Amino acid sequence: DLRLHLLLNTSVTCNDGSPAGYYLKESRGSRRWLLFLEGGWYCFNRENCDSRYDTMRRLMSSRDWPRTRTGTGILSSQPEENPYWWNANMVFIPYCSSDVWSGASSKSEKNEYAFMGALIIQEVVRELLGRGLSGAKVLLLAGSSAGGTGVLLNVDRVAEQLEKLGYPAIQVRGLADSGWFLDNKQYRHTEAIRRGIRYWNGVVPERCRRQFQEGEEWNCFFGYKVYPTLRSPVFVVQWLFDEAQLTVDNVHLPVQEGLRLYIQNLGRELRHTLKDVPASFAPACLSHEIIIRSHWTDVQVKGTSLPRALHCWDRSLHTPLKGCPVHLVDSCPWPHCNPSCPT
Ligand SMILES: Cc1ccc(Sc2ccc3n[nH]c(=O)n3n2)cc1
């Protein structure tokens, strides 16, 4: 179990002003720290956020959070469930800012909600330094869906504060799971995100912001556009046929030729955006499954599981390694052509 700690700086809050926090299970003796960003979409205006507060309040408030949580998947401490970092210090950061981890705006007389996702990450890191993070060799910032995009938006800022805070020895790396999206045409019929960013006062990485410039920061929410601007090593996990991608594309699954070509082209576009991502794991599956599920070990690409690929990535960060690959992108063109896809 990971134990809840509400942030000591109570000005860094969830949407409704309650304190943000993190769940922590220390593994002393281990110099590895895994900080996982929870996902859960976002909200982009007052009415849309009001609706999320009725029926998704845990994503907007810490008032009802549990004491503890069980680490699962990559957050598990059992070596059978987590061959990769079972012995690491485990941190689960709940998503309660509804801003894809990009916000830096408080509640005020003018703001019904606070959007502080970018500041929550900074404050968690700062408070963890007094709890052993100061001794880390590697800080892996990981996350799924909205948290996966959050990794891409925040990994370089975490590296920056640790350097500014006087900890240049900590190697900051990113693991973005299911947060790598395409701004493509729907099969049948960006604006919510563009409206979201203005509503949250959202912030994007500095190099990406300087390329796309004022009013175009939404581009930095798309992995293939923000990734090349990043300095920290980032491993990208993305289903070729991600269910959230297909949902926003208005695809729900006999398939006729128009939809067949659309689905096949989407997988190829995906595959193409990962061509120059050296550390990646992209199985040809239709799925919404994420890396904190207990059976995350089962999927393989070209015979290599994700826990193995991540270990090979670790070795690469000490010229490809014999028998221990890091770039694993399926080439077959249809959902579940890979026999190991989740059922
Ligand atoms: C471009 C972009 C748009 C939305 C998000 S946020 C998101 C996207 C999928 C998804 N599936 N399940 C879940 O919670 N999410 N959240 C991130 C980037």
Side-chain angles (χ1 to χ4, degrees), residues 39-42 95 100 144-147 149 178-179 181 193 218 221-222 242 244-245:
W41 292 100
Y42 61 90
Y95 182 39
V100 183
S144 300
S145 66
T149 309
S178 303
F181 300 112
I193 285 283
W218 67 267
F221 281 58
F222 288 90
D242 182 90
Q245 178 80 48

Side-chain angles (χ1 to χ4, degrees), residues 91-108 111-125 127-159 161-162 164-193 195-197 199-233:
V91 181
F92 175 88
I93 312 181
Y95 182 39
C96 67
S97 47
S98 311
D99 55 4
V100 183
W101 298 95
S102 75
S105 87
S106 291
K107 267 175 73 153
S108 69
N111 293 327
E112 180 67 11
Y113 298 109
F115 301 97
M116 311 200 63
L119 297 168
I120 290 168
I121 293 169
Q122 297 288 99
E123 185 63 34
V124 168
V125 164
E127 305 193 3
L128 283 177
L129 285 169
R131 278 169 169 292
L133 181 54
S134 49
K137 306 170 319 193
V138 182
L139 191 158
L140 180 55
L141 184 67
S144 300
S145 66
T149 309
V151 170
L152 300 172
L153 297 169
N154 289 279
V155 63
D156 274 9
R157 193 172 298 109
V158 170
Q161 70 179 303
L162 288 179
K164 287 179 189 228
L165 284 173
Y167 302 94
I170 304 174
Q171 298 188 50
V172 178
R173 313 168 179 170
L175 171 56
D177 167 33
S178 303
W180 185 277
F181 300 112
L182 303 178
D183 50 341
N184 64 347
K185 294 181 177 67
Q186 312 183 285
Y187 169 63
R188 183 177 292 115
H189 172 209
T190 73
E191 184 56 38
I193 285 283
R195 304 185 262 150
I197 295 169
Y199 188 50
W200 313 324
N201 182 57
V203 306
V204 297
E206 184 175 272
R207 179 170 297 105
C208 191
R209 179 185 65 241
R210 292 170 175 166
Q211 288 171 5
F212 291 99
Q213 297 182 320
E214 302 66 49
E216 299 278 338
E217 305 97 336
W218 67 267
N219 282 280
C220 300
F221 281 58
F222 288 90
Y224 77 99
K225 303 184 205 188
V226 63
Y227 173 94
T229 73
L230 299 183
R231 292 187 169 123
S232 308

